[PDB]
């Protein structure tokens, strides 16, 4: 529990770090993908790299000082599949090697409970075709068909030797539903004058929520049904700068101070004049560049890499990063009982989310960042 505790605190530092990253890539777009998902997985490996590469993972993934990473991660991974069956949720890892490299026998047993079915060895060698036609239909079925061909033209060839496949997604139901007819057209706006259509779901209800003075913006925590998951949105009370709007919370975002503008203990509940964007957003990123520039170099080169304890090969090193994830966010939720007269015993403010804002979907019980993302625009 606090073994664990250090691990998730890991996990949201290089969340952070490479959510930064992804936002320097696309200045004015939008941003999603699954910090959680990626660090199981770059986990993984490390158990497989030694010496300067496993340095390097442990230095840009923060594993710096956690003792029993590997069980820490075999628990968010019980959990969050424990989660998949009763939320319309789904979060396939996937370190897929070829045959080539024949896997230590330890590396394979250290690595067999804490990452149950997340290593898969295939023959992109010999077999690339059919290869990637088993990886495609297989993820397809992880995914319940939210991902069709998992794998990109130029993803995988005769010379993959170490591949990392993240495809995650995720349709929101919340515990206290917004209603249909109360959701309308109306405009988001993405700068200071600009603004785009939307279909803007509107509620009035209790929200545990509060004001960040220093960044000039407001926390709200928007829980899921049976409050497993909760979205916290991060809004600036007002767009002031040549872009988004979020210049200024992004310059001063990082590990520390995301733990404290979204830390549950400070805000309090508050009958919330509610009104965020619906919206479904599905982004496919290839955080090989933005990962180069956190740290991890020779992970990726096949001169410098070294995965001693994973085989004995040569040439061998992580050769591809395909992480792709889809966030669906409707009215669909379940009921709620609201407070007597929240009007005099209760403060009556208004989160509208019009406009551009970041946002984490976080494992309540674990405190893990499952999805991360901001929302410039539809």
């Given at each position: 529990q606090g073994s664990m505790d250090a691990l998730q605190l890991a996990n949201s530092a290089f969340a952070v770090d490479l959510f930064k990253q992804l936002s320097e890539k696309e200045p004015l777009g939008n941003v999603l993908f699954s910090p959680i998902a990626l660090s199981t997985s770059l986990s993984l490996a490390q158990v497989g790299a030694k010496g300067d590469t496993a340095n390097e993972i442990g230095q840009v993934l923060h594993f710096e000082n956690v003792k029993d990473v590997p069980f820490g991660f075999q628990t968010v991974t019980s959990d969050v599949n424990k989660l998949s069956s009763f939320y319309s949720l789904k979060l396939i890892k996937r370190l897929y090697v070829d045959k080539?490299?024949?896997?230590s026998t330890e590396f394979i047993s250290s690595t067999k409970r804490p990452y149950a079915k997340e290593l898969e060895t295939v023959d992109f060698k010999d077999k690339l075709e059919e290869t990637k036609g088993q990886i495609n239909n297989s993820i397809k079925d992880l995914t319940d068909g939210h991902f069709e061909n998992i794998l990109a033209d130029n993803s995988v060839n005769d010379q993959t030797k170490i591949l990392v496949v993240n495809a995650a997604y995720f349709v929101g139901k919340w515990m206290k539903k917004f209603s249909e007819s109360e959701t309308k057209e109306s405009p988001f706006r993405v700068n200071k004058t600009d603004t785009k259509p939307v279909q803007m779901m509107n509620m009035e209800a209790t929200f545990s929520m509060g004001n960040?003075?220093?960044?000039?913006s407001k926390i709200i925590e928007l829980p899921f049904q049976n409050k497993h998951l909760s979205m916290f949105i991060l809004l600036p009370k007002d767009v002031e700068d040549?872009?988004?709007?979020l210049e200024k919370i992004e310059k001063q975002l990082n590990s520390e101070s995301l733990s404290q503008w979204t830390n549950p203990s400070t805000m309090a509940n508050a009958k919330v004049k509610l009104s965020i964007p619906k919206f479904k957003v599905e982004k496919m990123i290839d955080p090989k560049a933005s990962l180069e520039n956190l740290g991890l170099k020779h992970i990726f080169s096949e001169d410098t890499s070294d995965f001693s304890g994973m085989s004995?090969?040569?040439?061998v090193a992580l050769s591809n990063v395909i992480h792709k994830v889809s966030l669906e966010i409707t009215e669909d939720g379940g009921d709620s009982i609201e407070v007597?007269?929240?009007?005099?015993?209760?403060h009556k403010d208004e989160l509208n989310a019009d406009h551009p804002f970041i946002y984490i979907i976080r494992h309540?019980?674990?405190?893990?960042?499952?999805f991360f993302g901001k929302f410039s625009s539809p």
């Amino acid at each position: 529990q606090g073994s664990m505790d250090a691990l998730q605190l890991a996990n949201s530092a290089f969340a952070v770090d490479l959510f930064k990253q992804l936002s320097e890539k696309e200045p004015l777009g939008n941003v999603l993908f699954s910090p959680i998902a990626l660090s199981t997985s770059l986990s993984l490996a490390q158990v497989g790299a030694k010496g300067d590469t496993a340095n390097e993972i442990g230095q840009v993934l923060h594993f710096e000082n956690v003792k029993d990473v590997p069980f820490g991660f075999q628990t968010v991974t019980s959990d969050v599949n424990k989660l998949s069956s009763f939320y319309s949720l789904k979060l396939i890892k996937r370190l897929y090697v070829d045959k080539s490299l024949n896997l230590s026998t330890e590396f394979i047993s250290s690595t067999k409970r804490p990452y149950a079915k997340e290593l898969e060895t295939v023959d992109f060698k010999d077999k690339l075709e059919e290869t990637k036609g088993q990886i495609n239909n297989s993820i397809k079925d992880l995914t319940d068909g939210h991902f069709e061909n998992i794998l990109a033209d130029n993803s995988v060839n005769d010379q993959t030797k170490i591949l990392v496949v993240n495809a995650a997604y995720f349709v929101g139901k919340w515990m206290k539903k917004f209603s249909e007819s109360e959701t309308k057209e109306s405009p988001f706006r993405v700068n200071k004058t600009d603004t785009k259509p939307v279909q803007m779901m509107n509620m009035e209800a209790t929200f545990s929520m509060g004001n960040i003075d220093s960044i000039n913006s407001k926390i709200i925590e928007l829980p899921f049904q049976n409050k497993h998951l909760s979205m916290f949105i991060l809004l600036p009370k007002d767009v002031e700068d040549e872009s988004t709007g979020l210049e200024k919370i992004e310059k001063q975002l990082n590990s520390e101070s995301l733990s404290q503008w979204t830390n549950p203990s400070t805000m309090a509940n508050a009958k919330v004049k509610l009104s965020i964007p619906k919206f479904k957003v599905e982004k496919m990123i290839d955080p090989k560049a933005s990962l180069e520039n956190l740290g991890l170099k020779h992970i990726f080169s096949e001169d410098t890499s070294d995965f001693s304890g994973m085989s004995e090969t040569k040439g061998v090193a992580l050769s591809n990063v395909i992480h792709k994830v889809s966030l669906e966010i409707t009215e669909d939720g379940g009921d709620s009982i609201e407070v007597p007269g929240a009007r005099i015993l209760q403060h009556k403010d208004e989160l509208n989310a019009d406009h551009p804002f970041i946002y984490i979907i976080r494992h309540n019980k674990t405190r893990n960042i499952i999805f991360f993302g901001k929302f410039s625009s539809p």
